[PDB]
Amino acid sequence: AEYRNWSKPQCNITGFAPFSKDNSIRLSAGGDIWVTREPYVSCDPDKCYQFALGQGTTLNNGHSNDTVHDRTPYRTLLMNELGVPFHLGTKQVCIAWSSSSCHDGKAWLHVCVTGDDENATASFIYNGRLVDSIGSWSKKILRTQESECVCINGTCTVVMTDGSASGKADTKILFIEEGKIVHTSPLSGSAQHVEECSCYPRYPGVRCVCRDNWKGSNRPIVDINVKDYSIVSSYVCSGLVGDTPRKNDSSSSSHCLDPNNEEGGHGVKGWAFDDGNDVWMGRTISEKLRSGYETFKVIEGWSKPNSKLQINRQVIVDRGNRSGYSGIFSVEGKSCINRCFYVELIRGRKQETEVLWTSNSIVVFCGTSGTYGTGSWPDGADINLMPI
Amino acid sequence: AEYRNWSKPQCNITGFAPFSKDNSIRLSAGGDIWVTREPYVSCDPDKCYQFALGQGTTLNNGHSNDTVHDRTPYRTLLMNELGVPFHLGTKQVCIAWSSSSCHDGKAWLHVCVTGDDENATASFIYNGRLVDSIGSWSKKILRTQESECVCINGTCTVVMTDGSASGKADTKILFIEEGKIVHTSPLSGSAQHVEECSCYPRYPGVRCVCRDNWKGSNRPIVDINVKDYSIVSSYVCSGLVGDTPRKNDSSSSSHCLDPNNEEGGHGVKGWAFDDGNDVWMGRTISEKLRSGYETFKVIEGWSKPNSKLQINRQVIVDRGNRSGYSGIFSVEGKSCINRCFYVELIRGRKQETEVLWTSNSIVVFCGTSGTYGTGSWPDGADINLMPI
Amino acid sequence: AEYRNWSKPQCNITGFAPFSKDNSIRLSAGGDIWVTREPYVSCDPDKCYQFALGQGTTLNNGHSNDTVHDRTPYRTLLMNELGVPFHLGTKQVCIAWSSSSCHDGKAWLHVCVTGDDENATASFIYNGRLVDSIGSWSKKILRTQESECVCINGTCTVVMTDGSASGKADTKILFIEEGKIVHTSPLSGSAQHVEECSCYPRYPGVRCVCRDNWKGSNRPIVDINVKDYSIVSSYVCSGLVGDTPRKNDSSSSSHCLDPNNEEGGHGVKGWAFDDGNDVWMGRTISEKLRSGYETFKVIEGWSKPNSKLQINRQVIVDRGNRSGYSGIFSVEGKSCINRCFYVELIRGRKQETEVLWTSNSIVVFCGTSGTYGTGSWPDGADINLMPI
Amino acid sequence: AEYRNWSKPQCNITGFAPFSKDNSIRLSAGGDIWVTREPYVSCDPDKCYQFALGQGTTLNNGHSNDTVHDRTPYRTLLMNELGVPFHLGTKQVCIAWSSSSCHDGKAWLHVCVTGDDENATASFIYNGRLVDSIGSWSKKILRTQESECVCINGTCTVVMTDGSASGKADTKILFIEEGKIVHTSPLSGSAQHVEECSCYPRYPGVRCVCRDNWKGSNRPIVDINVKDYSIVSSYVCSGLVGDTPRKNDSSSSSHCLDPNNEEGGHGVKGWAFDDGNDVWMGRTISEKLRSGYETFKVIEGWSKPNSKLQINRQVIVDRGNRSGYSGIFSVEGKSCINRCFYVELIRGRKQETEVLWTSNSIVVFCGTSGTYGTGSWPDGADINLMPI
Ligand SMILES: *[C@@H]1O[C@H](CO)[C@@H](O[C@@H]2O[C@H](CO)[C@@H](O[C@@H]3O[C@H](CO[C@H]4O[C@H](CO)[C@@H](O)[C@H](O)[C@@H]4O)[C@@H](O)[C@H](O[C@H]4O[C@H](CO)[C@@H](O)[C@H](O)[C@@H]4O)[C@@H]3O)[C@H](O)[C@H]2NC(C)=O)[C@H](O)[C@H]1NC(C)=O
Ligand SMILES: *[C@@H]1O[C@H](CO)[C@@H](O[C@@H]2O[C@H](CO)[C@@H](O[C@@H]3O[C@H](CO[C@H]4O[C@H](CO)[C@@H](O)[C@H](O)[C@@H]4O)[C@@H](O)[C@H](O[C@H]4O[C@H](CO)[C@@H](O)[C@H](O)[C@@H]4O)[C@@H]3O)[C@H](O)[C@H]2NC(C)=O)[C@H](O)[C@H]1NC(C)=O
Ligand SMILES: *[C@@H]1O[C@H](CO)[C@@H](O[C@@H]2O[C@H](CO)[C@@H](O[C@@H]3O[C@H](CO[C@H]4O[C@H](CO)[C@@H](O)[C@H](O)[C@@H]4O)[C@@H](O)[C@H](O[C@H]4O[C@H](CO)[C@@H](O)[C@H](O)[C@@H]4O)[C@@H]3O)[C@H](O)[C@H]2NC(C)=O)[C@H](O)[C@H]1NC(C)=O
Ligand SMILES: *[C@@H]1O[C@H](CO)[C@@H](O[C@@H]2O[C@H](CO)[C@@H](O[C@@H]3O[C@H](CO[C@H]4O[C@H](CO)[C@@H](O)[C@H](O)[C@@H]4O)[C@@H](O)[C@H](O[C@H]4O[C@H](CO)[C@@H](O)[C@H](O)[C@@H]4O)[C@@H]3O)[C@H](O)[C@H]2NC(C)=O)[C@H](O)[C@H]1NC(C)=O
Ligand SMILES: *[C@@H]1O[C@H](CO)[C@@H](O[C@@H]2O[C@H](CO)[C@@H](O)[C@H](O)[C@H]2NC(C)=O)[C@H](O)[C@H]1NC(C)=O
Ligand SMILES: *[C@@H]1O[C@H](CO)[C@@H](O[C@@H]2O[C@H](CO)[C@@H](O)[C@H](O)[C@H]2NC(C)=O)[C@H](O)[C@H]1NC(C)=O
Ligand SMILES: *[C@@H]1O[C@H](CO)[C@@H](O[C@@H]2O[C@H](CO)[C@@H](O)[C@H](O)[C@H]2NC(C)=O)[C@H](O)[C@H]1NC(C)=O
Ligand SMILES: *[C@@H]1O[C@H](CO)[C@@H](O[C@@H]2O[C@H](CO)[C@@H](O)[C@H](O)[C@H]2NC(C)=O)[C@H](O)[C@H]1NC(C)=O
Ligand SMILES: CC(=O)N[C@H]1[C@H]([C@H](O)[C@H](O)CO)O[C@@](O)(C(=O)O)C[C@@H]1O
Ligand SMILES: CC(=O)N[C@H]1[C@H]([C@H](O)[C@H](O)CO)O[C@@](O)(C(=O)O)C[C@@H]1O
Ligand SMILES: CC(=O)N[C@H]1[C@H]([C@H](O)[C@H](O)CO)O[C@@](O)(C(=O)O)C[C@@H]1O
Ligand SMILES: CC(=O)N[C@H]1[C@H]([C@H](O)[C@H](O)CO)O[C@@](O)(C(=O)O)C[C@@H]1O
Ligand SMILES: [Ca+2]
Ligand SMILES: [Ca+2]
Ligand SMILES: [Ca+2]
Ligand SMILES: [Ca+2]
């Protein structure tokens, strides 16, 4: 076993093909299945795993009531092979109401945050043992990616924020070797608010596309140099912007440097990645709600400020059905590194009042250089057939 | 780990001996078990797995209502070790409402088709990662074997059809190396309609027996040359024909070249294989319905047009009990390659109206050169004891 | 991986110490657990497994009604690591209403009998594939040990009977190499009726203690020579006899050569083994019913006709609680081969009428050369708290 | 695979960071989960496992009634990877109503005690086989640590007691090599009553902190020399004492040599360990009840009689919530040996009368040399939402 370096070119991308779906809410109506949110996917060199933050209960269970809240002492990070839904034999790998995980080629790192809002603890678990921990630096909900971290040559990097959800906060990038924090760098650059980064290897460094919860409906970019620990940041150039909420497609804009100040407050975790001067990106179909999910390429949308020339659109979830968070993960092939993404399909409160719980299922697609058709792969549960 | 070449002679066959049964419908009345259809079996060099297309729900679950339909965005391919029934810890390996899987000696290939009827996508997943995809070529339900594919020296082959279920369609044979499509050949020869092929290694090539849904109650044969990609096809010679529906044994016929035009419309997935000039084949016992299941040898039934001289009959499922699809898989022994088959035992709608769901169990037999007795191994559930 | 030869001396035995218990009936009242009977234990060189014949259903399930019957097409052999109760993820390794399994050092052999009473089939599965099969030789319930077989230097041996349960039958000993039957020898010697043998390695051969269902309440012995295939048989010498039913301890007898003709009809599977001239044996405490379970040594009870001098008694299950079958298995230690046994704890019909099902749990003890105390480890379920 | 020697220095400790939590009582209200008590954690060189003594039943099950009792023939030791809650696929590794387990670098040892109070048996199982057993030496509930044993260079040591819970008893330290007892030493030194020791490697020997159930609310220490089998004992010096019950912090005392005779009767399993002259220790927050849980360092609390100068306090479970037993386990890092602890969170009878059962969940923390914040991680079930 050798460390991963991810030193292959990005695969050619013509769009995305279906990869996995867990159907977990449909299963929850006839089976004991965990209540979750904030899912993601990350793969070791052989095979992929699905992860999510449990709510310390199954769905058909009195403890599923009022699971809309994001942070409790009962949330744990669940980890199963991809496509195995979160049944009662699922391993809870750490105590977490925010997390990130990744494999360095040799073993798994988990970054797990729990405890009081004003004084949380992050644990750093590597190859099955606690190696490091830190306390909150700004006393305002220390929190992290909710998707995979990225490791090159044994140095894993993860983005964390502590501070306001609606104003200037303190973001830092940690560099971790076999579980030990070896350096911490503050965020630098023109991104003004950074949360929930979706990061990917872009050898020789790591590139992240994030959520600006304050003034941007355009997504921040954070670039991380793992050799010298330097950080740069800005915003995706595309005038078709990636956050929710956002303005409509004719009114929206980005010019790469600053938050657009267009319905910038609040947001949703999402992703994008560059392909030469173009950008591939996903977003909800609704501009206001976490409903629908579409991907497309914006021609020159990485390099040219405010480009809106899209092509190669695919519907992942039709506009009539619920989506949620989405994130990137990367998979090493024989000759190239592929990009894949998952979509959280949130069901229950507050939007759906027939039940008292909040949970989700997942759907997952991977880049292809081949061809594909059309469809829609929503959660699929009938809210009226669920236990309350 | 080396690629499989299957370069051993076929084992001697005197008939078939019991191998596996999962009892899944009986278990579903007191346990959380997936709703399935279109099951099959395929083995890696060590051990066998059962697969089937899930319906995105367990049976005792409101979402099992009206699971008679064949294609939805919730169907996934399930994969367990053979004899482990589809419980909630079962892995969903891909999104699929049609599939085929096989192991090349090194890793698993899955061919998984999903999305809109008029514009489906097939994903090609190998060693746990998406390697290729194609879109529908004829915009009319791209679909595949619903049983194992076959790999020689690292080149796996799979038969797919796109086009009418009741007239000329477009069948193609794909050749796939570590998940990458390297060649596609159109069907050639005198088979006029080919679906749901049951294929087996017949070194140096692959031989398939299929379903003609249009004009044949005799089964098509497709022979695939993996070295030069050439294809030949025709029909099993036996006058005791393998499809359902079919005429009775005195009225039925085949003369090897053409569909017989005898109750040829519709059909069921099945199998046969040659043993010198003779053929071993399975079929439903009923000529009209998917009820009962029998195997026998037809003397000269591979080589002599319209031969009806049977011997070595075995009842697998008595005439009074339900069957379904059946397919072949092959298993490498010390000195020879054995042939085995499974039978899908379908329960529920439309035929049984006491319940609202449709699902199945499996029973599996393998070739023997020894001796054996008699019996009947049906699904065994009492429809009146099931959840509706 | 090398073949086992079992060429170490028997361990010193002072009695038996607790090893495993599964509590499966207690668990069945609050969990989905298989209905079973005829359990046993067998270990590969690393670890032990529990096996039993399923009844194709869980206990809290309408299909558990009238599971008293011994042979149906739904019975399968279940196999889990020892101490893991038969939950819904349990593997059904073959179709069987009679079975025997054993590991030769390299892989598992399963001998699985199913089908019609008058014309059964035995399948021989080795390293996960069907290698051989035979049909019934006497058309009267071909049947086998219901406990582990034994392999020396790659040759596994198993005892099977076909014929009357209440008169002369046809017993044969099969010799099987990597799943292939290489020789079959008829029973020879003075045992007059032999069923359900509990066999153990006694290098250079195999020694079995069995059930005489016809005229003996003393247990038969069958000795098997694996080099030349010769067979000898007789009866355990001990005047404290091992079957149920039997006469009381003052009236019972054995003189080593013949069935005692004392309450000889019917019987229960059990075991014994020699220790020099002495014998270690288990039996039910009741002389009429499968209730209680005790072990003891009979001084000179292997060599001296009708010896009744017992010592080192241990109660395993108190007289007030139900037992069932019991069998031997052997485990290789650093310097010696240990002997262990399991006891089936049968609950439900016909004896207990509060429920409609019949099932069992297990308890398991292993030889020790150390010391121990006293106790009683019965099934423990309260029949009045069970689903009917 | 080599034997562990634990010959690295203790890691620096600044306090403890969250490691694992299983949420098992919350899950039990909507899932089939074992009833347990007396849990602990122990790790092989790769990964950690959670263990506990089952009560032979799940919680939503009539057999969970009156599970307050500590010893029955149905209790077994359960073992899962850490964070996997005790679902129905959990392995019961031995019959036990008292236990200890540990891995020597090569394989697992389990010490399992069961049977009659006045004449119990301890089984010693190593690498999956029974290797040794002993009977009760004093006929008064032979019993052991209920947490991990410790092995150096292949010699594992375990502390056991037999005798009164409220007066002089007979404690012995056993030394076990690949499952075989090679030496037994009696307790020696000034500890007057020793139960439920929490032991850790302190190369070249083993150090334990225990429970005095007779006259001490200060905890005993037992030091074990694995080379010459000699034993020394005394009491933790800290005037902030570790048992429950105890006097308040101003009235309590210890002077290192003798039991303090302060609310000394009864007790709870707990732990402490030295860090130079200082001691790190956990205790319940309540002085009378098993409620709350806190850890802190007592400056000079290892070396200076009656020191009460605490620093670095952390709440693990707030004062308003239930705790239970707690124990130490040790984990080998790249350069140092870390200390971790678990807390049993007991729910149900006798204290909570809304239900008829008694069970627990777990929470687990590991030493850190980093930083951390604050929180509280209690069991979290709502007693009014549980099955009775
Ligand atoms: C079977 O499945 C395939 C694959 O999914 C479908 O093909 C895709 O079809 C979509 C929708 O048409 C294509 O994406 C769209 O591309 C447009 C740009 O391409 C056109 O214009 C350029 C420039 O002149 C031409 O070079 C090019 O050849 C095309 O003529 C974008 O304008 C589209 O965005 C606009 O419309 C969408 C709604 O469709 C809005 O949401 C946007 O806001 C915007 O107004 C869009 O991106 C995609 O490129 C095709 N893929 C491929 C690989 O061909 C088939 O349509 C489908 N067939 C059926 C019947 O289901
Ligand atoms: C115990 O189990 C064994 C093994 O399963 C059973 O033996 C099989 O029995 C079946 C049924 O008889 C045999 O299959 C049949 O073979 C017939 C041809 O063989 C006979 O005729 C030839 C030519 O003259 C002779 O050489 C040969 O020795 C036989 O005399 C076919 O004609 C049969 O097909 C016809 O009948 C079946 C119904 O049985 C119809 O469905 C068909 O449409 C057709 O009319 C059939 O194929 C089989 O070969 C035997 N196997 C072996 C290996 O011997 C035992 O019968 C069974 N005993 C009991 C009591 O259960
Ligand atoms: C704690 O646990 C230990 C270990 O389990 C118990 O010791 C065993 O006790 C049993 C019962 O006494 C012993 O088994 C019996 O051995 C008798 C023969 O030994 C005695 O006689 C000989 C010959 O004179 C002496 O050499 C020897 O020292 C003994 O004095 C048999 O006669 C017994 O069988 C008879 O009684 C039983 C009921 O007990 C009947 O069911 C039989 O039909 C028959 O009448 C019996 O086999 C056993 O040997 C002891 N084991 C060991 C290793 O010592 C302790 O008794 C137990 N203490 C308590 C209080 O629970
Ligand atoms: C965020 O989280 C951090 C880490 O958990 C919290 O910091 C810990 O805070 C606790 C409570 O104050 C500290 O533990 C306490 O240490 C006291 C000794 O230290 C003080 O006094 C010495 C000697 O003069 C000074 O050198 C030192 O700098 C400190 O000023 C003990 O006296 C305390 O025990 C007493 O109070 C507790 C209740 O707190 C009682 O239960 C005891 O009986 C006793 O009366 C206690 O041990 C701990 O050391 C801090 N950790 C670290 C690493 O700094 C932050 O407080 C928290 N912030 C918030 C707002 O949540
Ligand atoms: C669902 O959960 C809510 C939130 O905890 C429960 O409401 C709390 O109930 C407690 C116990 O009576 C009250 O003290 C709190 O004031 C309630 N909080 C709020 C916001 O209402 C509620 O009881 C639970 N059950 C249902 C059926 O709603
Ligand atoms: C079983 O499933 C059917 C098919 O989806 C359900 O029937 C549909 O119900 C919706 C919601 O009311 C209607 O809009 C559709 O028109 C119905 N379709 C048909 C074909 O009837 C049915 O409600 C489900 N439940 C039961 C008990 O039958
Ligand atoms: C329990 O199983 C028995 C045995 O199969 C069932 O009884 C059979 O019921 C069928 C269907 O009505 C009858 O044709 C058979 O004659 C019955 N056999 C006997 C021996 O009675 C019985 O119905 C099942 N259910 C219960 C509640 O007893
Ligand atoms: C809960 O368990 C208790 C303890 O076993 C049960 O009470 C026993 O019930 C038996 C059977 O009637 C009586 O002979 C015993 O005398 C009872 N013992 C005691 C201490 O009361 C009780 O029945 C069980 N069920 C419930 C609902 O309490
Ligand atoms: C609390 C926490 O750690 N993360 C939560 C974040 C933050 O509230 C925002 O990023 C603002 O900081 O967003 C969610 O609320 C959301 O939008 O669905 C869910 C997630 O659990
Ligand atoms: C829809 C699909 O992909 N395959 C389906 C096929 C096709 O309808 C036919 O082969 C005609 O094309 O047959 C089934 O309907 C059937 O007969 O039981 C089930 C299967 O799911
Ligand atoms: C039918 C079969 O294969 N074996 C059965 C045997 C035989 O009936 C006897 O050995 C007589 O032949 O005994 C049982 O009935 C029994 O006594 O509990 C159970 C077992 O399933
Ligand atoms: C019975 C047994 O083996 N151990 C039990 C011990 C002993 O009773 C005491 O240590 C006194 O000896 O403590 C418990 O009761 C307790 O306090 O919660 C539980 C545990 O099961
Ligand atoms: Ca925003
Ligand atoms: Ca047809
Ligand atoms: Ca008898
Ligand atoms: Ca005390």
Residue numbers in the entry:
A (entry chain AAA), B (entry chain AAA), C (entry chain AAA), D (entry chain AAA): 82 to 469
Paper text:
The enzymatic active site of influenza NA is also a target of several FDA-approved antivirals.
We aimed to analyze the fitness effects of mutations in the NA of H3N2 A/Moscow/10/1999 (Mos99) using deep mutational scanning. Although the sialidase enzymatic activity is the major function of NA, mutational tolerance and the distance from active site only showed weak correlation (Spearman’s rank correlation = 0.18). The second cluster was at the membrane proximal side of the NA head domain, consisting of five residues with low mutational tolerance, namely R283, R288, D304, D355, and W383. Specifically, R283, R288, D304, and D355 form a network of electrostatic interactions. As a result, the low mutational tolerance of these five residues is likely due to their critical role in NA folding stability.
